[PDB]
Amino acid sequence: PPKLCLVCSDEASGCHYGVLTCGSCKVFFKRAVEGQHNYLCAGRNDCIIDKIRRKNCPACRYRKCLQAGMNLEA
Amino acid sequence: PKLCLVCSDEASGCHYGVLTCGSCKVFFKRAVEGQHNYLCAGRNDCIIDKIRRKNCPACRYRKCLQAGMNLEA
DNA sequence: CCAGAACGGAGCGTTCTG
DNA sequence: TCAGAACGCTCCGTTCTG
Ligand SMILES: C[As](C)(=O)[O-]
Ligand SMILES: [Zn+2]
Ligand SMILES: [Zn+2]
Ligand SMILES: [Zn+2]
Ligand SMILES: [Zn+2]
């Protein structure tokens, strides 16, 4: 019964930064929190984040990582 | 103070038949020749501006066409 | 099993040329 | 004039490494 990334719903590879996620979201989040995450949504801050569309809006993908509970120290 | 009709950045000239910037010029060339189809994460209504145009190639491309951008022109 | 690094690919935007 | 090539850059995601 495949476990699913809580950010993007791709198949999860494990528990990363405290949350069931895929590898791309693990490493997106690491990039976002270390960089200057000055991301802008071109829509209404409710973009659909899935495997096909997660590249599209880092702002909304980052928000979802935060709402899911991701954090570096866990 | 002429502005790109796709993204409202500073326009560099007339490209493919529309007053556009350089990034929109080359983006549209790439979009057309490359047959890759895009999908909006929002509502096919994204705000395309200097910073946000990176975010939705689907909406940016739709705007290039509605502006009348055209190869052979 | 997980974090962090590395690596190759894609896309974007400038610059230069004629 | 503007079309096009090309390059350096950022970001992405899979794979390694510790
Ligand atoms: C294009 As790939 C499989 O190296 O992310
Ligand atoms: Zn994911
Ligand atoms: Zn968004
Ligand atoms: Zn433009
Ligand atoms: Zn869009």
Q: State this model's resolution in angstroms.
A: 2.5
Sequence letter at residue B36: H
* Total tally of structural domains belonging to chain B: 1
Can you spell out the DSSP letters for A39-55?
---SSSS----STTTTT
The answer to whether the C-beta of A63 is closer than 7 A to strand D is no
Rounded to whole angstroms, the Cα distance separating B31 from B16 reads 13
Residues 11-70 of A with CB under 8 A from B: 40-44, 46-49, 52-53, 56-57, 60
For residue B73, give its domain range. Answer: 1-73
How far is Cα B30 from Cα B71, in angstroms, rounded to an integer? Answer: 11
> Separation of A49 CA from ligand 3 center, angstroms?
9
Structure determined by: X-ray
Do A52 and B39 meet the contact criterion of CB atoms below 8 Å apart? Answer: yes
Contact B63, B46 (CB under 8 A): no
Rounded distance between C-alpha atoms, residue B30 and residue B69, angstroms: 13
Sign of CA dihedral B61, B66, B67, B71: positive
Q: Which residue has the tokens 């190639």?
A: B57
Q: For residue B21, which nucleotide's C1' is closest to its Cα?
A: C13
